[PDB]
Scaffold this active site. Structure first.
Site, PDB file in Angstrom:
ATOM      1  CG  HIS A  21      -2.097  -0.970   1.005  1.00  0.00           C
ATOM      2  ND1 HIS A  21      -3.105  -0.806   0.076  1.00  0.00           N
ATOM      3  CD2 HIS A  21      -2.294  -2.190   1.560  1.00  0.00           C
ATOM      4  CE1 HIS A  21      -3.893  -1.860   0.089  1.00  0.00           C
ATOM      5  NE2 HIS A  21      -3.430  -2.711   0.997  1.00  0.00           N
ATOM      6  CD1 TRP A  91      -6.158   1.497   1.788  1.00  0.00           C
ATOM      7  CD2 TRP A  91      -6.788  -0.569   1.145  1.00  0.00           C
ATOM      8  NE1 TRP A  91      -6.369   1.531   0.416  1.00  0.00           N
ATOM      9  CE2 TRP A  91      -6.766   0.277   0.005  1.00  0.00           C
ATOM     10  CE3 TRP A  91      -7.158  -1.927   0.991  1.00  0.00           C
ATOM     11  CZ2 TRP A  91      -7.083  -0.190  -1.283  1.00  0.00           C
ATOM     12  CZ3 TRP A  91      -7.461  -2.404  -0.303  1.00  0.00           C
ATOM     13  CH2 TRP A  91      -7.400  -1.529  -1.432  1.00  0.00           C
ATOM     14  CE1 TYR A 137      -6.519  -6.035 -15.004  1.00  0.00           C
ATOM     15  CE2 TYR A 137      -6.092  -6.707 -12.752  1.00  0.00           C
ATOM     16  CZ  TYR A 137      -6.866  -6.738 -13.872  1.00  0.00           C
ATOM     17  OH  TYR A 137      -7.977  -7.543 -13.867  1.00  0.00           O
ATOM     18  CG  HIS A 174      -9.193  -6.265  -7.868  1.00  0.00           C
ATOM     19  ND1 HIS A 174     -10.094  -5.573  -7.094  1.00  0.00           N
ATOM     20  CD2 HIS A 174      -8.292  -5.346  -8.312  1.00  0.00           C
ATOM     21  CE1 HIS A 174      -9.758  -4.290  -7.053  1.00  0.00           C
ATOM     22  NE2 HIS A 174      -8.686  -4.116  -7.815  1.00  0.00           N
ATOM     23  CE1 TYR A 189      -3.248  -5.057  -8.909  1.00  0.00           C
ATOM     24  CE2 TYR A 189      -3.560  -3.128 -10.354  1.00  0.00           C
ATOM     25  CZ  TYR A 189      -4.078  -4.140  -9.534  1.00  0.00           C
ATOM     26  OH  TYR A 189      -5.434  -4.308  -9.277  1.00  0.00           O
TER      27      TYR A 189
END
Ligand code: CEI
Ligand code: CA
Ligand code: CA
Ligand code: CA
Length: 194
Positions: A21, A91, A137, A174, A189
Protein backbone atom coordinates in the site's frame (compact mmCIF):
# COMPACT_ATOMS: atom_id res chain seq x y z
CA UNK A 1 -14.98 -23.42 -6.91
CA UNK A 2 -11.80 -21.51 -6.31
CA UNK A 3 -13.22 -18.25 -7.61
CA UNK A 4 -15.70 -18.06 -4.71
CA UNK A 5 -13.37 -19.42 -1.97
CA UNK A 6 -11.96 -16.49 0.06
CA UNK A 7 -10.21 -16.33 3.47
CA UNK A 8 -12.35 -15.41 6.52
CA UNK A 9 -9.64 -13.10 7.85
CA UNK A 10 -6.23 -11.66 7.02
CA UNK A 11 -3.22 -10.24 8.83
CA UNK A 12 -2.26 -6.59 8.56
CA UNK A 13 0.67 -5.19 10.43
CA UNK A 14 3.26 -7.01 8.33
CA UNK A 15 5.87 -5.79 5.79
CA UNK A 16 4.13 -7.10 2.62
CA UNK A 17 0.83 -5.26 3.44
CA UNK A 18 2.61 -2.06 4.42
CA UNK A 19 4.98 -1.93 1.41
CA UNK A 20 2.29 -2.82 -1.13
CA UNK A 21 0.00 0.00 0.00
CA UNK A 22 2.93 2.40 0.46
CA UNK A 23 3.87 2.03 -3.20
CA UNK A 24 0.24 2.70 -4.21
CA UNK A 25 -0.02 5.68 -1.84
CA UNK A 26 3.13 7.28 -3.27
CA UNK A 27 1.95 6.73 -6.82
CA UNK A 28 -1.56 8.14 -6.17
CA UNK A 29 -0.12 11.19 -4.28
CA UNK A 30 -0.18 13.24 -7.47
CA UNK A 31 1.06 16.52 -5.89
CA UNK A 32 3.63 14.66 -3.81
CA UNK A 33 2.64 16.38 -0.56
CA UNK A 34 2.56 13.19 1.55
CA UNK A 35 -1.24 13.23 1.90
CA UNK A 36 -3.74 11.46 -0.27
CA UNK A 37 -7.23 12.72 -1.19
CA UNK A 38 -10.21 11.08 -2.86
CA UNK A 39 -9.65 13.68 -5.66
CA UNK A 40 -6.17 12.20 -6.33
CA UNK A 41 -7.42 8.58 -6.07
CA UNK A 42 -10.36 9.11 -8.50
CA UNK A 43 -8.05 10.97 -10.94
CA UNK A 44 -5.61 8.07 -11.14
CA UNK A 45 -7.75 5.06 -10.46
CA UNK A 46 -10.82 6.10 -12.49
CA UNK A 47 -10.36 9.15 -14.83
CA UNK A 48 -6.98 8.09 -16.35
CA UNK A 49 -7.76 4.35 -16.46
CA UNK A 50 -11.22 4.71 -18.07
CA UNK A 51 -9.73 7.17 -20.66
CA UNK A 52 -6.95 4.69 -21.47
CA UNK A 53 -9.55 1.85 -21.84
CA UNK A 54 -11.83 4.09 -24.02
CA UNK A 55 -14.79 3.51 -21.67
CA UNK A 56 -18.15 5.09 -22.61
CA UNK A 57 -19.59 7.90 -20.47
CA UNK A 58 -22.01 5.51 -18.74
CA UNK A 59 -19.25 3.01 -18.08
CA UNK A 60 -17.02 5.79 -16.72
CA UNK A 61 -19.74 7.15 -14.38
CA UNK A 62 -20.44 3.69 -13.11
CA UNK A 63 -16.79 3.01 -12.56
CA UNK A 64 -16.24 6.27 -10.76
CA UNK A 65 -19.23 5.73 -8.44
CA UNK A 66 -17.76 2.28 -7.50
CA UNK A 67 -14.28 3.74 -6.88
CA UNK A 68 -15.79 6.48 -4.71
CA UNK A 69 -17.73 3.93 -2.64
CA UNK A 70 -14.69 1.69 -2.26
CA UNK A 71 -12.36 4.42 -1.05
CA UNK A 72 -14.97 6.02 1.15
CA UNK A 73 -14.87 2.59 2.79
CA UNK A 74 -11.19 3.34 3.62
CA UNK A 75 -12.10 6.72 5.12
CA UNK A 76 -11.35 8.90 2.06
CA UNK A 77 -13.37 11.94 1.02
CA UNK A 78 -13.08 14.71 -1.53
CA UNK A 79 -10.94 17.53 -0.15
CA UNK A 80 -9.83 15.47 2.87
CA UNK A 81 -6.07 15.13 3.09
CA UNK A 82 -5.01 11.88 4.72
CA UNK A 83 -1.49 10.74 5.71
CA UNK A 84 -0.24 7.23 5.06
CA UNK A 85 -0.73 5.70 8.58
CA UNK A 86 -4.41 6.76 8.63
CA UNK A 87 -4.77 5.54 5.05
CA UNK A 88 -3.47 2.09 6.22
CA UNK A 89 -5.94 2.12 9.19
CA UNK A 90 -8.74 2.67 6.66
CA UNK A 91 -7.63 -0.18 4.37
CA UNK A 92 -7.45 -2.53 7.42
CA UNK A 93 -11.08 -1.62 8.31
CA UNK A 94 -12.21 -2.04 4.69
CA UNK A 95 -10.57 -5.43 4.09
CA UNK A 96 -11.75 -6.80 7.47
CA UNK A 97 -15.31 -5.65 6.84
CA UNK A 98 -15.42 -6.92 3.23
CA UNK A 99 -14.10 -10.41 4.07
CA UNK A 100 -16.86 -10.69 6.71
CA UNK A 101 -19.49 -9.52 4.17
CA UNK A 102 -18.27 -12.16 1.70
CA UNK A 103 -18.58 -14.95 4.30
CA UNK A 104 -22.12 -13.77 5.13
CA UNK A 105 -23.32 -13.43 1.51
CA UNK A 106 -23.59 -9.63 1.73
CA UNK A 107 -22.63 -7.51 -1.31
CA UNK A 108 -19.06 -6.21 -1.31
CA UNK A 109 -17.58 -2.98 -2.69
CA UNK A 110 -14.74 -4.90 -4.35
CA UNK A 111 -17.17 -7.12 -6.30
CA UNK A 112 -19.16 -4.11 -7.49
CA UNK A 113 -15.96 -2.44 -8.67
CA UNK A 114 -15.05 -5.68 -10.48
CA UNK A 115 -18.36 -5.54 -12.33
CA UNK A 116 -17.65 -2.01 -13.56
CA UNK A 117 -14.15 -2.83 -14.81
CA UNK A 118 -15.28 -6.16 -16.35
CA UNK A 119 -17.95 -4.35 -18.37
CA UNK A 120 -15.31 -2.06 -19.79
CA UNK A 121 -12.90 -4.86 -20.69
CA UNK A 122 -15.66 -6.94 -22.30
CA UNK A 123 -15.61 -4.87 -25.53
CA UNK A 124 -17.66 -7.33 -27.55
CA UNK A 125 -20.25 -7.87 -24.77
CA UNK A 126 -19.76 -11.64 -24.88
CA UNK A 127 -19.87 -12.02 -21.07
CA UNK A 128 -16.29 -13.25 -20.89
CA UNK A 129 -12.84 -11.67 -21.32
CA UNK A 130 -10.76 -13.32 -24.04
CA UNK A 131 -6.95 -13.00 -24.21
CA UNK A 132 -7.25 -10.29 -26.96
CA UNK A 133 -9.39 -8.12 -24.56
CA UNK A 134 -6.99 -8.50 -21.62
CA UNK A 135 -4.50 -5.91 -20.45
CA UNK A 136 -1.56 -5.49 -18.10
CA UNK A 137 -2.91 -3.64 -15.04
CA UNK A 138 0.48 -2.02 -14.35
CA UNK A 139 0.58 -0.66 -17.85
CA UNK A 140 -2.98 0.73 -18.14
CA UNK A 141 -2.56 2.38 -14.75
CA UNK A 142 0.90 3.71 -15.52
CA UNK A 143 2.54 2.42 -12.34
CA UNK A 144 4.52 -0.25 -14.31
CA UNK A 145 4.64 1.12 -17.83
CA UNK A 146 6.97 -1.72 -18.96
CA UNK A 147 4.72 -4.55 -17.84
CA UNK A 148 4.00 -7.02 -20.65
CA UNK A 149 3.22 -10.37 -19.03
CA UNK A 150 -0.45 -10.14 -20.08
CA UNK A 151 -0.74 -13.77 -21.01
CA UNK A 152 0.78 -15.05 -17.71
CA UNK A 153 -1.59 -12.96 -15.56
CA UNK A 154 -4.50 -14.02 -17.83
CA UNK A 155 -3.69 -17.70 -17.31
CA UNK A 156 -3.40 -17.24 -13.52
CA UNK A 157 -6.74 -15.36 -13.43
CA UNK A 158 -8.38 -18.21 -15.40
CA UNK A 159 -8.94 -20.50 -12.36
CA UNK A 160 -11.08 -23.05 -14.26
CA UNK A 161 -8.75 -23.02 -17.35
CA UNK A 162 -11.79 -22.29 -19.60
CA UNK A 163 -9.57 -20.11 -21.77
CA UNK A 164 -11.46 -16.93 -20.86
CA UNK A 165 -12.27 -14.85 -17.79
CA UNK A 166 -15.53 -14.27 -16.03
CA UNK A 167 -16.26 -11.41 -13.62
CA UNK A 168 -16.00 -13.66 -10.58
CA UNK A 169 -12.47 -14.77 -11.66
CA UNK A 170 -11.33 -11.19 -12.25
CA UNK A 171 -12.73 -10.13 -8.83
CA UNK A 172 -11.13 -13.14 -7.02
CA UNK A 173 -7.64 -12.26 -8.41
CA UNK A 174 -8.14 -8.55 -7.52
CA UNK A 175 -9.25 -9.38 -3.95
CA UNK A 176 -6.29 -11.77 -3.74
CA UNK A 177 -3.89 -8.99 -4.51
CA UNK A 178 -5.41 -6.28 -2.30
CA UNK A 179 -7.18 -7.94 0.69
CA UNK A 180 -5.51 -11.28 1.31
CA UNK A 181 -2.06 -10.77 -0.41
CA UNK A 182 -2.10 -14.22 -2.05
CA UNK A 183 1.42 -15.07 -3.21
CA UNK A 184 0.04 -16.45 -6.50
CA UNK A 185 -1.15 -12.96 -7.44
CA UNK A 186 2.23 -11.29 -6.83
CA UNK A 187 3.40 -9.35 -9.92
CA UNK A 188 -0.17 -8.58 -11.08
CA UNK A 189 0.62 -4.86 -11.27
CA UNK A 190 4.17 -5.27 -12.58
CA UNK A 191 7.45 -4.19 -10.95
CA UNK A 192 5.98 -0.91 -9.63
CA UNK A 193 4.04 -2.68 -6.86
CA UNK A 194 5.63 -5.24 -4.49
O1 CEI B 1 -6.71 -2.74 -10.64
C1 CEI B 1 -7.69 -2.03 -10.97
C2 CEI B 1 -8.61 -2.28 -12.12
C3 CEI B 1 -9.48 -3.43 -11.60
C4 CEI B 1 -9.33 -4.72 -12.13
C5 CEI B 1 -10.07 -5.86 -11.74
C6 CEI B 1 -11.03 -5.71 -10.74
O2 CEI B 1 -11.75 -6.78 -10.32
C7 CEI B 1 -11.20 -4.44 -10.15
C8 CEI B 1 -10.45 -3.33 -10.59
N1 CEI B 1 -8.01 -0.91 -10.17
C9 CEI B 1 -7.31 -0.59 -8.95
N2 CEI B 1 -7.48 -1.47 -7.89
C10 CEI B 1 -6.92 -1.24 -6.66
C11 CEI B 1 -6.27 -0.01 -6.49
C12 CEI B 1 -5.64 0.36 -5.29
C13 CEI B 1 -5.18 -0.62 -4.38
C14 CEI B 1 -4.49 -0.30 -3.22
C15 CEI B 1 -4.29 1.03 -2.85
O3 CEI B 1 -3.60 1.36 -1.67
C16 CEI B 1 -4.72 2.01 -3.74
C17 CEI B 1 -5.38 1.69 -4.96
N3 CEI B 1 -6.10 0.86 -7.53
C18 CEI B 1 -6.64 0.60 -8.76
C19 CEI B 1 -6.40 1.53 -9.90
C20 CEI B 1 -4.93 1.84 -9.95
C21 CEI B 1 -4.40 3.12 -9.70
C22 CEI B 1 -3.02 3.38 -9.78
C23 CEI B 1 -2.11 2.37 -10.06
C24 CEI B 1 -2.64 1.09 -10.27
C25 CEI B 1 -4.04 0.81 -10.23
CA1 CA C 1 -1.42 14.67 -2.27
CA1 CA D 1 -15.60 -10.52 -24.53
CA1 CA E 1 -12.38 -19.05 -16.78
Amino acid sequence: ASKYAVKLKTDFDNPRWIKRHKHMFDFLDINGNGKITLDEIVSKASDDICAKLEATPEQTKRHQVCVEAFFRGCGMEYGKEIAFPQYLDGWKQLATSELKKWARNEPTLIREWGDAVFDIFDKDGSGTITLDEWKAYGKISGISPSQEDCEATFRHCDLDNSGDLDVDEMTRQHLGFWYTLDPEADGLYGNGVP
